[PDB]
Amino acid sequence: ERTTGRQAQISNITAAKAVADVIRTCLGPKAMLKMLLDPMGGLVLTNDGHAILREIDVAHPAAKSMLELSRTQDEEVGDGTTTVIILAGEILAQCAPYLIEKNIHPVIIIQALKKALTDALEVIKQVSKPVDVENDAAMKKLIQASIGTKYVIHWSEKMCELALDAVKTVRKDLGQNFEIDIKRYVRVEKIPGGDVLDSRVLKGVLLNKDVVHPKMSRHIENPRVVLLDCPLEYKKGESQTNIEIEKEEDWNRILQIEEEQVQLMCEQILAVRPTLVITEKGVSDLAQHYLLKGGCSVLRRVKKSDNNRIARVTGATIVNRVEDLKESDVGTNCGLFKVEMIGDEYFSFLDNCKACTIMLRGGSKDILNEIDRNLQDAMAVARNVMLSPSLSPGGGATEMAVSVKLAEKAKQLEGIQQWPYQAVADAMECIPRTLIQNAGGDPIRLLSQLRAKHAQGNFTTGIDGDKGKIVDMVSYGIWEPEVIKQQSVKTAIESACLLLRVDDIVSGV
Template structure:
C-alpha cells in the first residue's frame, strides 16, 4: 500500500525552516527601517495619518510603531518591544528596535551558514550578560552627588533628537526643576520621583519658550458657575465619581400614580435627594467639589450659596492624581453598610488654595500646596497642536530619563560611545572562547555598531570612516592602560568628528543602555526561536450556520 505524503491535515498554510526565518527577519527589518531615520540628534520626523485623517508628526519610536498597525506576527514583537522600553525607561525606543532587528539579521546569516539556532541563542545570551556587566563595571560613571548640570545634560541628550532641540537648554532646566519638585520618600525610605505627579497642560499661543512650570495641579476646566468664588483657601477637596443631577427613577421602574398631587411630590423628592447629598458634602467641610460626571444647574445654586467651587467633568486620570496628592478618597457612592447615605469628613483632601486662572483662552483651576505629595504642572505653549503634542512626547521622554538618572545615579557617554566600546570588547571576548558561541558573539559585537552607523548616516556624514575611527579609539582605550579615558569617545554629529562625549555633556543613564541590550536580545531570541509558522484558515462552514 502506498503511503500518501505524511503531512498532518492542517486547515491552513504551514511554513517551516528557513522560509519562516527569512520572512520574520525581513518583516523586522522593514519595521526597523521605518524608525531608523529618526534616530539621533539629526534624525528626521515621521508624519502619520490615521484612518480618520488625524495627523501625528513625531520622532518618538514608540509612538511611530504604536500607530502603525503592524500585521506581521514577528514584527508585532518589535512593536511590543518598543512599548516595553517606553514603559520601563521612557526613552531609547528607536535604538531598541534597530538593535533587535540587526541582531536578527546577523543571526539569520549564521543559521544559513549551518550554525544551529540554539548555539546562536546561547551565544547571544552570553554576549548580553557580558555586555551588561561591562557597562556596569567599566563604562558607567558614578555621579554621586548629581549636580544639576549632569541632570540637565541628560535631559538635553534625550531632547536632542526631538523638535525642541533648539531650545533644549530652556526645556532641560524646566524638566529638571519639575522632577526635583516631585521628590518623595516612600515608606521604605527610598527616594522616588513619581513623574506621574507632573501634569502637562498644552495651551495654544505664544512661542515654545513661553512655557513655564506651575507649582500646583492644573485642571483644564473652569468653575462650573460664574457665581462661585475665584479662590478658596485653605481648600478642603471632595473627589466624587457620580452624577450630582436630579436623581431619576431607574429604567424599568414603573410607578402607578392615582393622585396627580403625588406626582408633584415625586418630582420634589427627586430634587431634594440631590440637595441632601450636596448638603452632606458641604456639612463634612468641603469647599471644593470635583466630580468626573455632571452637576446640573439646580444643584449648582447650592454650591454658589455656600461659596464653594465645584468643577464638573474632570478627567478620571486627573482625579486619581489629585486624590493621591491631597490625600482625598475618591467616592463613587454615598451608600454605607447600613443602607443610608453618608459622607465622612475623612474622605476630604487638603490643599493650601484652589484658584481659577486664565491661561491663553481657557479657564484653568489650579490646586496649590497639596498636602501629601507635591504636584507640579508644566504649561506648554506653542504654535499648533502638532507641535504641542510632539513637545509633550519629548518632555515625557526627558522626564523619564531624568528620573532614571536620579534613581540609578550612574551615567554613560552617549553618541554611540557605549556601543562602540562594547563591540570592541565583545569581539576580543569572542576570540578567547573556543566554543561554538564564538561566532554568535562576534556577530553580536558587529550588530551593536549599527547604532553609531545609523547616527552617522542620519547626520549625512561618512559612516564607514567615522565608525572605523571610533573603533580605533576604543581599541586603544581597552588595550593600553594609560589611555583608559578614551573609553567615552563618541560621535559629534554636528561637526562630523569624534570627541569625548562625557566632557561634551552628551550623557544618558546607564540603566537605559543596559535595558536596551537586554530587551533587544530577548526579542531577537524570541523571534529566532521560531522555525515553523502555521496560519489557520477561517473555517467557512461555521460562518454559514
C-alpha cells in the same frame, strides 16, 4: 501556505532587517521626521521611533515581532526606542551568514548569543558611572542629553527644567523604592498658541470646567476643597420604587420631598464650611442655589484622573456619601482658585502660588504633540536615573566598548561557538556607525579610529553628532541612563534569539 527551511529563516531575517531600515535615519542628532498618515484621519510628524513604528501596520510575522520590540522598550525606559530596533535587526542580520553559510544550527547560535549577552551587559555596567540624582545641575545636563535629536531642542534647557520640576514633584520615596507615577500624577495640557517659554509646570491642576452658577466666586483666596464621587441631585431607589397616589394634596407632598433631600445634601457639604466643591458627577440646579448662599463655588463633571490629582494638591480626600462626610476631608494646602479665560475658553486653576500639571504652549495643536512626546522622553530618562543613578557613555561609546571586550573575548574562545559570539560584537558597532552616517562623515574611517582609540585610550569616547568627528564623552558629555543600555541590549538579543528558533512558518487559525 508553508515555508520550512532556510526559506523561513531568510524571510524572517530580511523582514526584521527591513524593519530597522526604516527608522535608521531617525537615530542620531540630525535625525529626520517621518510624517506618518494614520487611518483615522490626522497625522503624526514625530521622529521618536516607537511613535512611528506604531503607525505602520506590517505583515511578515518577524516584522511584527521586530515592531513590538520598540514598544516593550518604550515601556521600560522612555528613551532608546529607535536604537533597540536597529540593534535588534543588525544582530539577526550579523548572524545570517554563520546561520546558513557556516551551517551552524540555531540551537548553537542561540547558546552563544545568550552567553555573549551577559558578558556584553557586564561591559555596560563596567563603563557606567553613577550620578547625583539630587544635584539639580546634573539632572538637567542629563535630561538635556536625551532632548537633543528632537524638535524640542531649541529650548533644551527650558525643557529639562519642566522635566525635573515635574519628576520630583510627583515623586514620593516611601520605604519600609521611590515610586514616580508620571502617568497618573503629571497630567499634561497642551494649549495652542503663545510661545514655548510661555509654558510652566503649575503645581496643582488645570480644568477648563467653569463655575456651576453665574454669581459664584471666581477665585477663593485659600479655598476649602471638597471632592466627591456621588452626584448632587435627587437620588432614587435601587428596587422597584413605585408610588401610588389618590390622596389629592399628596402630589405636592412628594414633589416637595425632592427639594428637601437636595437641601440635606447641601447641608452635609456646607457643614465642613467649604468654598470649593468639585464633584465627578452632576449638580442639581437646586443644589447650586443652596451651595451658592451656603458660600462656595461649584464644579460639576470632572474625570476621575482629573479629580484624584486634585486630591493630592488639596489633600482633600474624596468622599462618597455625605452623612459620613468627615472634617478631615478638608481643602488645606491649596493656593488660589483662578479662573483665567484663555481665548474664549474659561479655565480654572488650583496652584499653591504631590502631582503637578505641565502646561505646554507652542504654535499649533499639531506642534504641541511633538513637544508632549519629546517631553515624555525627557521626563522618563529623569525617572530612570531617579531609580538607577547610573549613566552610560553616550555618542554610541558604550555600544563600541561592548563591541571590543566582546570581539576580543570571542576571538579568544575557539569552537564553532565563536562565530555567533563574534557577530554580537560586530553587530553592536552599528550604532556608532548609524550615528556617524547620519552625521555625514566617513563610517569606515571614523569607526576604525573610534574603535582603535577605544581599544586602548578610554571607553567613554563616542562620535559627535553635528560634527562627525570622534570625541571623548567626558569632554563634551552626553551620557544616557545606564538603564537604556540595559534594555536595548537585553531584548534585542532576545528578539534575535526568538526569531532564530523559527524554521517553519504556517498560515490558518
